[PDB]
Nucleic acid binder design. Sequence first.
DNA 1: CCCGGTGCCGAGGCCGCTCTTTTGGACGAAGACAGCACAAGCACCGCAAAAACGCACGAACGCGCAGACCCCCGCGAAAAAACCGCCAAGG
Length: 49
Amino acid sequence: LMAQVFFGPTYYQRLRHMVDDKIHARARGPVQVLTRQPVEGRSRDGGLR
DNA sequence: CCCGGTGCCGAGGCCGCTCTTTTGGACGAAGACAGCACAAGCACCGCAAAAACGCACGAACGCGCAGACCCCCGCGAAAAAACCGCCAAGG
């Protein structure tokens, strides 16, 4: 490489936010009883606002 | 009674204080509440003392015989019961 590279060990930490705990998709599913709109929440297979 | 004027109710304008309404978007997870309890009736389980069924005894029923004694008849003696009457003392 034409440019030299800064290089060495550094202390890194893994945070709790992982993509597989955030990915969510919905085509159709449960709806609220009062308004008949998609429910809220990824855990409940909800929709996006 | 004409020229003029005052207080008067009346008039609108304006300043102050009270009420109302709203304050970014999206997403995630977890955790903890949701009236509720006390007094009651229809029905059940199971306990008190009255009840089931066998067995063996022997009591009481039956029958057959005995004869005692109770009923009934009789004739007369015996006696009270019945009848009649005067009258006194007690109700």
